[PDB]
Design an enzyme around this catalytic site. Structure first.
Site, PDB file in Angstrom:
ATOM      1  CE1 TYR A  56      -7.595  11.539   1.358  1.00  0.00           C
ATOM      2  CE2 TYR A  56      -8.742  11.433  -0.723  1.00  0.00           C
ATOM      3  CZ  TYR A  56      -7.577  11.110   0.057  1.00  0.00           C
ATOM      4  OH  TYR A  56      -6.908  10.575  -0.991  1.00  0.00           O
ATOM      5  CE1 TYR A  97      -4.106   2.500   1.028  1.00  0.00           C
ATOM      6  CE2 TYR A  97      -2.430   3.977   1.838  1.00  0.00           C
ATOM      7  CZ  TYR A  97      -3.486   3.589   1.219  1.00  0.00           C
ATOM      8  OH  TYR A  97      -4.469   4.201   1.281  1.00  0.00           O
ATOM      9  CG  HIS A 156      -7.357   4.811  -0.689  1.00  0.00           C
ATOM     10  ND1 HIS A 156      -6.512   4.078  -0.009  1.00  0.00           N
ATOM     11  CD2 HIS A 156      -8.971   4.382  -0.567  1.00  0.00           C
ATOM     12  CE1 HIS A 156      -7.325   3.971   0.653  1.00  0.00           C
ATOM     13  NE2 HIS A 156      -8.472   3.378   0.054  1.00  0.00           N
TER      14      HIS A 156
HETATM   15  C1  COA Z   1       1.478  12.540  -9.434  1.00  0.00           C
HETATM   16  C2  COA Z   1       2.625  12.762  -9.167  1.00  0.00           C
HETATM   17  C3  COA Z   1       2.891  12.229  -7.875  1.00  0.00           C
HETATM   18  C4  COA Z   1       3.635  12.928 -10.340  1.00  0.00           C
HETATM   19  O1  COA Z   1       5.706  13.054  -9.927  1.00  0.00           O
HETATM   20  P1  COA Z   1       5.947  13.696 -11.239  1.00  0.00           P
HETATM   21  O2  COA Z   1       7.435  13.765 -10.854  1.00  0.00           O
HETATM   22  O3  COA Z   1       5.447  14.740 -11.928  1.00  0.00           O
HETATM   23  O4  COA Z   1       5.869  12.743 -12.332  1.00  0.00           O
HETATM   24  P2  COA Z   1       7.056  11.875 -13.386  1.00  0.00           P
HETATM   25  O5  COA Z   1       8.360  13.298 -13.879  1.00  0.00           O
HETATM   26  O6  COA Z   1       7.424  10.378 -13.859  1.00  0.00           O
HETATM   27  O7  COA Z   1       5.447  11.715 -14.932  1.00  0.00           O
HETATM   28  C5  COA Z   1       5.734  10.229 -15.639  1.00  0.00           C
HETATM   29  C6  COA Z   1       4.932  10.343 -16.048  1.00  0.00           C
HETATM   30  O8  COA Z   1       3.235  10.963 -15.301  1.00  0.00           O
HETATM   31  C7  COA Z   1       1.921  11.185 -16.707  1.00  0.00           C
HETATM   32  N1  COA Z   1       1.494  12.434 -16.198  1.00  0.00           N
HETATM   33  C8  COA Z   1       2.042  12.636 -14.632  1.00  0.00           C
HETATM   34  N2  COA Z   1       1.761  14.331 -14.797  1.00  0.00           N
HETATM   35  C9  COA Z   1       0.617  14.647 -15.610  1.00  0.00           C
HETATM   36  C10 COA Z   1       0.237  15.627 -15.540  1.00  0.00           C
HETATM   37  N3  COA Z   1       0.376  16.557 -14.920  1.00  0.00           N
HETATM   38  N4  COA Z   1      -0.666  15.562 -16.907  1.00  0.00           N
HETATM   39  C11 COA Z   1      -0.463  13.756 -17.904  1.00  0.00           C
HETATM   40  N5  COA Z   1       0.409  13.365 -17.826  1.00  0.00           N
HETATM   41  C12 COA Z   1       0.899  13.565 -16.849  1.00  0.00           C
HETATM   42  C13 COA Z   1       3.362  11.318 -17.812  1.00  0.00           C
HETATM   43  O9  COA Z   1       2.673  10.484 -19.128  1.00  0.00           O
HETATM   44  C14 COA Z   1       4.316  11.210 -17.007  1.00  0.00           C
HETATM   45  O10 COA Z   1       5.322  11.194 -18.419  1.00  0.00           O
HETATM   46  P3  COA Z   1       5.865  12.511 -18.597  1.00  0.00           P
HETATM   47  O11 COA Z   1       6.051  13.349 -17.887  1.00  0.00           O
HETATM   48  O12 COA Z   1       7.081  11.859 -19.986  1.00  0.00           O
HETATM   49  O13 COA Z   1       4.799  12.930 -19.639  1.00  0.00           O
HETATM   50  C15 COA Z   1       3.176  14.510  -8.908  1.00  0.00           C
HETATM   51  O14 COA Z   1       1.912  15.036  -9.759  1.00  0.00           O
HETATM   52  C16 COA Z   1       2.707  15.028  -7.570  1.00  0.00           C
HETATM   53  O15 COA Z   1       3.939  14.529  -6.472  1.00  0.00           O
HETATM   54  N6  COA Z   1       1.762  14.572  -7.504  1.00  0.00           N
HETATM   55  C17 COA Z   1       0.508  15.675  -6.073  1.00  0.00           C
HETATM   56  C18 COA Z   1       0.854  14.153  -5.195  1.00  0.00           C
HETATM   57  C19 COA Z   1      -0.488  13.164  -4.927  1.00  0.00           C
HETATM   58  O16 COA Z   1      -1.151  14.294  -4.274  1.00  0.00           O
HETATM   59  N7  COA Z   1      -0.749  12.973  -5.217  1.00  0.00           N
HETATM   60  C20 COA Z   1      -1.141  11.334  -4.525  1.00  0.00           C
HETATM   61  C21 COA Z   1      -0.960   9.772  -5.039  1.00  0.00           C
HETATM   62  S1  COA Z   1      -0.409   9.429  -3.227  1.00  0.00           S
HETATM   63  C1  U3V Z   2      -6.472   9.409   4.600  1.00  0.00           C
HETATM   64  N1  U3V Z   2      -5.846   9.063   3.847  1.00  0.00           N
HETATM   65  C2  U3V Z   2      -4.609   9.148   3.034  1.00  0.00           C
HETATM   66  O1  U3V Z   2      -4.377  10.137   3.798  1.00  0.00           O
HETATM   67  C3  U3V Z   2      -3.512   8.253   2.676  1.00  0.00           C
HETATM   68  C4  U3V Z   2      -2.473   7.434   3.927  1.00  0.00           C
HETATM   69  C5  U3V Z   2      -2.974   7.006   5.271  1.00  0.00           C
HETATM   70  C6  U3V Z   2      -1.924   7.626   5.576  1.00  0.00           C
HETATM   71  C7  U3V Z   2      -2.171   6.337   7.226  1.00  0.00           C
HETATM   72  N2  U3V Z   2      -3.173   5.096   6.983  1.00  0.00           N
HETATM   73  C8  U3V Z   2      -2.640   4.059   7.552  1.00  0.00           C
HETATM   74  O2  U3V Z   2      -0.956   3.865   7.866  1.00  0.00           O
HETATM   75  C9  U3V Z   2      -2.855   3.051   7.298  1.00  0.00           C
HETATM   76  C10 U3V Z   2      -3.558   2.700   6.183  1.00  0.00           C
HETATM   77  C11 U3V Z   2      -4.229   1.165   6.092  1.00  0.00           C
HETATM   78  C12 U3V Z   2      -4.004   0.046   5.535  1.00  0.00           C
HETATM   79  C13 U3V Z   2      -4.778   0.625   4.317  1.00  0.00           C
HETATM   80  C14 U3V Z   2      -3.014  -0.616   4.812  1.00  0.00           C
HETATM   81  C15 U3V Z   2      -5.162  -0.842   5.614  1.00  0.00           C
HETATM   82  N3  U3V Z   2      -3.606   0.575   7.705  1.00  0.00           N
HETATM   83  N4  U3V Z   2      -3.470   1.394   7.917  1.00  0.00           N
HETATM   84  C16 U3V Z   2      -3.281   2.238   9.536  1.00  0.00           C
HETATM   85  C17 U3V Z   2      -4.175   5.353   6.467  1.00  0.00           C
HETATM   86  C18 U3V Z   2      -3.636   6.073   4.993  1.00  0.00           C
HETATM   87  N5  U3V Z   2      -3.030   8.182   1.714  1.00  0.00           N
HETATM   88  C19 U3V Z   2      -3.846   8.977   0.202  1.00  0.00           C
HETATM   89  O3  U3V Z   2      -4.918   9.221   1.035  1.00  0.00           O
HETATM   90  C20 U3V Z   2      -3.268  10.241  -0.755  1.00  0.00           C
HETATM   91  C21 U3V Z   2      -1.883  11.131   0.004  1.00  0.00           C
HETATM   92  C22 U3V Z   2      -3.030  12.272   0.143  1.00  0.00           C
HETATM   93  C23 U3V Z   2      -3.409  12.644  -1.201  1.00  0.00           C
HETATM   94  C24 U3V Z   2      -4.206  11.199  -2.444  1.00  0.00           C
HETATM   95  O4  U3V Z   2      -5.101  11.702  -3.055  1.00  0.00           O
HETATM   96  N6  U3V Z   2      -3.758  10.000  -1.620  1.00  0.00           N
END
Ligand code: COA
Ligand code: U3V
Length: 150
Positions: free
Chosen positions: A135, A69, A108
Site C-alpha cells: 500500500y 483474485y 491481499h
Molecule cells: C473479514 C470480513 C469480510 C468477515 O465478514 P463477516 O461477515 O464478519 O464474516 P462471517 O460472519 O461470515 O464470519 C465467519 C467466520 O470468520 C471468522 N472471523 C470473522 N471475523 C472474526 C473476528 N473478528 N475474530 C475472529 N474470527 C473471526 C470466524 O470463525 C467466523 O465464524 P463465527 O462468526 O461463526 O465465529 C469482515 O470483518 C469485514 O468486512 N472486514 C473489513 C473488510 C476488510 O478490510 N477486509 C479485507 C479483505 S478484501
Molecule cells: C491496493 N490494493 C487493493 O486495494 C486491493 C485491490 C486492488 C484493486 C485494483 N487492482 C486491480 O484491478 C488489479 C489486480 C490485479 C491482479 C492482482 C489480478 C494482477 N490486476 N489488476 C488490474 C489492484 C488491486 N485490495 C486489497 O488490498 C484488499 C482490500 C483493501 C483492504 C485489504 O486489506 N485488502
C-alpha cells in the site's frame, strides 16, 4: 436473512458508497467500470433487504495459471459476524467449483487486519507471502497474500 444481488448501473453508487466506508483504499472509476463487466464476480450483500456489503473479483492469468483474485470483500461493521462474509466467499468458491478451470483464489490482506486473516484461514486460505510496501498511502503498508488451492 442474507441475500446477494447483482451490481448494475442502477445500484453501482450503493457499491461505491459501501466500499468507501468499509475499505481504507479509494478505488478509481476504472475499478467500478470493470466491476460491471465481471458479472457474477461482483455482488451486493443484503441483510433484510438493506445493502450492507459487497464482493468484487477479477480473473487473472499469471504464474501460467488461471486464478481468481478477490479485490474487495467486506461488510459494514455493525453487520459483521452474521454470516454475510461467508455467504459472499461461498458464492465466489461456488463460481470456481462450477467453472472447474481455476487453479487458485488469492487476495491481499493488510497485515494489521487480524479478523480478515482469521476469516480467510477458516476457509483454507494460507499466507503464501508477505509483500512489503504493498500500500502507498496507508499504514501499515505491508500486505499478506492469501491463497486457497483449488
Ligand atoms: C473479514 C470480513 C469480510 C468477515 O465478514 P463477516 O461477515 O464478519 O464474516 P462471517 O460472519 O461470515 O464470519 C465467519 C467466520 O470468520 C471468522 N472471523 C470473522 N471475523 C472474526 C473476528 N473478528 N475474530 C475472529 N474470527 C473471526 C470466524 O470463525 C467466523 O465464524 P463465527 O462468526 O461463526 O465465529 C469482515 O470483518 C469485514 O468486512 N472486514 C473489513 C473488510 C476488510 O478490510 N477486509 C479485507 C479483505 S478484501
Ligand atoms: C491496493 N490494493 C487493493 O486495494 C486491493 C485491490 C486492488 C484493486 C485494483 N487492482 C486491480 O484491478 C488489479 C489486480 C490485479 C491482479 C492482482 C489480478 C494482477 N490486476 N489488476 C488490474 C489492484 C488491486 N485490495 C486489497 O488490498 C484488499 C482490500 C483493501 C483492504 C485489504 O486489506 N485488502
Amino acid at each position: 436473512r442474507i441475500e446477494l444481488g447483482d451490481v448494475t448501473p442502477h445500484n453501482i453508487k450503493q457499491l461505491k458508497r459501501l466500499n468507501q466506508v468499509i475499505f481504507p483504499v479509494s478505488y478509481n472509476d476504472k475499478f467500478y467500470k470493470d466491476v460491471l463487466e465481471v458479472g457474477e464476480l461482483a455482488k451486493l450483500a443484503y441483510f433484510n433487504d438493506i445493502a450492507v456489503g459487497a464482493v468484487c473479483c477479477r480473473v487473472d492469468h499469471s504464474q501460467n495459471q488461471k486464478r481468481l483474485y478477490i479485490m474487495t470483500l467486506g461488510c459494514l461493521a455493525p453487520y459483521r459476524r452474521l454470516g454475510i462474509g461467508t455467504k459472499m466467499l461461498n458464492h465466489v468458491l461456488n463460481i470456481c467449483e462450477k467453472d472447474g478451470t481455476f487453479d487458485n483464489i488469492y487476495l491481499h490482506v493488510q497485515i494489521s487486519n487480524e479478523s480478515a486473516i482469521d476469516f480467510y484461514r477458516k476457509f483454507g486460505f494460507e499466507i503464501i507471502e508477505t509483500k512489503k510496501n504493498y500500500y502507498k498511502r496507508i499504514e501499515p503498508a505491508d500486505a499478506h497474500v492469501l491463497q486457497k488451492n483449488l
